[PDB]
Design an enzyme around this catalytic site. Structure first.
Site, PDB file in Angstrom:
ATOM      1  N   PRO A   1       0.822  -1.216   0.000  1.00 54.34           N
ATOM      2  CA  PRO A   1       0.000   0.000   0.000  1.00 54.34           C
ATOM      3  C   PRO A   1       0.855   1.264   0.000  1.00 54.34           C
ATOM      4  O   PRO A   1       2.003   1.227   0.448  1.00 54.34           O
ATOM      5  CB  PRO A   1      -0.799  -0.111   1.301  1.00 54.34           C
ATOM      6  CG  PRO A   1      -0.767  -1.556   1.654  1.00 54.34           C
ATOM      7  CD  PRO A   1       0.552  -2.066   1.170  1.00 54.34           C
ATOM      8  N   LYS A  32      -0.802  -5.985   6.490  1.00 55.51           N
ATOM      9  CA  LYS A  32       0.266  -6.180   5.525  1.00 55.51           C
ATOM     10  C   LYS A  32       1.614  -6.120   6.226  1.00 55.51           C
ATOM     11  O   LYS A  32       1.748  -5.472   7.269  1.00 55.51           O
ATOM     12  CB  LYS A  32       0.220  -5.112   4.422  1.00 55.51           C
ATOM     13  CG  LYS A  32      -0.974  -5.222   3.492  1.00 55.51           C
ATOM     14  CD  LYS A  32      -0.608  -5.963   2.216  1.00 55.51           C
ATOM     15  CE  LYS A  32      -1.803  -6.074   1.284  1.00 55.51           C
ATOM     16  NZ  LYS A  32      -1.414  -6.609  -0.049  1.00 55.51           N
ATOM     17  N   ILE A  64      -4.048  -2.229  -4.057  1.00 58.95           N
ATOM     18  CA  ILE A  64      -4.678  -2.990  -5.126  1.00 58.95           C
ATOM     19  C   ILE A  64      -6.056  -3.439  -4.658  1.00 58.95           C
ATOM     20  O   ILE A  64      -6.215  -3.946  -3.539  1.00 58.95           O
ATOM     21  CB  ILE A  64      -3.795  -4.175  -5.540  1.00 58.95           C
ATOM     22  CG1 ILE A  64      -2.513  -3.658  -6.194  1.00 58.95           C
ATOM     23  CG2 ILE A  64      -4.548  -5.105  -6.487  1.00 58.95           C
ATOM     24  CD1 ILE A  64      -1.597  -4.747  -6.670  1.00 58.95           C
TER      25      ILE A  64
END
Ligand code: NA
Lengths: 101, 108, 106
Positions: A1, A32, A64
Site C-alpha cells: 500500500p 500487511k 490494489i
C-alpha cells in the site's frame, strides 16, 4: 500500500520518525507486512481544510483492489500530531497490478 | 472538493491567503459549499511544464459528481484559469489543470 | 505525459537541473515530444519505502489516452535514469502508472 500525508504543520514541528511509525501502524491496520507499506509525508504546505487554514492533515491510501480503517488512522494521527478528528480527511484509492513498477 | 496546486514559485512569491481565496473561488465554480472545499498548495518545487522550467503551476481538482465530462470540465477550467492567472501573475500557457472524479466510497 | 517525483533526499542533494534532464529522458523513453512532457520534483520529504527510511524516490507517470512489454521497457529505462541521477539502488525506487483521458484536461 501507498500512504501520502500532506500537512500544513511546519517541518520543524512534526515528530521525528513520524513516517516510520505511520508505516508500522498502517501495516497493522491494513494487515500487511511493514516492508510492503510505503509512506510519504509532505510537511510545511499551505492548506485549507473544510475552508479553514487551522492546522490539518490529508491522508491518502492506495492499494490494489477496494479497501473501520478510518477510525484506526484517526486514532493514530490525532495522537501523533495533536490534531482533532475534524482537522483530518482520509481518501482511499484503488489500484490495478498493471500500475505497479 | 479537493484542490492540489504544485508550483515552482518560491513560497515568498505565492500571495498570502491564496489557499483561502482559492477555497471561495472553487466553491462558486463547482457549486459546492465552502466548508466542503479543501485546498493544498505546494510551493518551491522543481518543475518543467511543456518542456520549460519557467514559473508555472499545476492544479488537480477532485470531487464527487461534478468533474466527470468534457462539457463540465471545459466550463470549470475557464473560471479556474482566470482566477489563477490573476493571483499568480502567470500566463495561461504556464498553467495545466487536471480533473479527477471521485467515487462516494473513497471518502473515509 | 505528467511525471511526479517524490524523494526524501534534501533539495541540496538533488542534482541541479534534474527536472530538465528527466523531461528530456521521458520524451525519449515514452516517445513523446518534449513540449508535451511535464515534470514535478518534490524533494526534502519524509519517506518510508519498503519499510526503510533510507534515501528513496517514488515516480508517478500519467499519460493521456500501453502493452505489458511497453510499460516493462519504460519502467526499466526510468530505473536506469533515476539510479544514475540520484545514486540510489533499484530497491529504493518505486514507479506507478496512472491512466488519463483527454476529457480530464482543462
Ligand atoms: Na460529473
Amino acid at each position: 500500500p501507498f500512504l501520502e500525508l500532506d500537512t500544513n504543520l511546519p517541518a520543524n514541528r512534526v515528530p521525528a520518525g513520524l513516517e516510520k511509525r505511520l508505516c508500522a501502524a498502517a501495516a497493522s491496520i491494513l494487515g500487511k507486512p511493514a516492508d510492503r507499506v510505503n509512506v510519504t509525508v509532505r510537511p510545511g504546505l499551505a492548506m485549507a481544510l473544510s475552508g479553514s487554514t487551522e492546522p490539518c492533515a490529508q491522508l491518502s491510501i492506495s492499494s490494489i483492489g477496494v479497501v473501520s480503517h478510518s477510525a484506526h488512522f484517526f486514532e493514530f494521527l490525532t495522537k501523533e500530531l495533536a490534531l482533532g478528528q475534524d482537522r483530518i480527511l482520509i481518501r482511499f484509492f484503488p489500484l490495478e497490478s498493471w500500475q505497479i513498477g
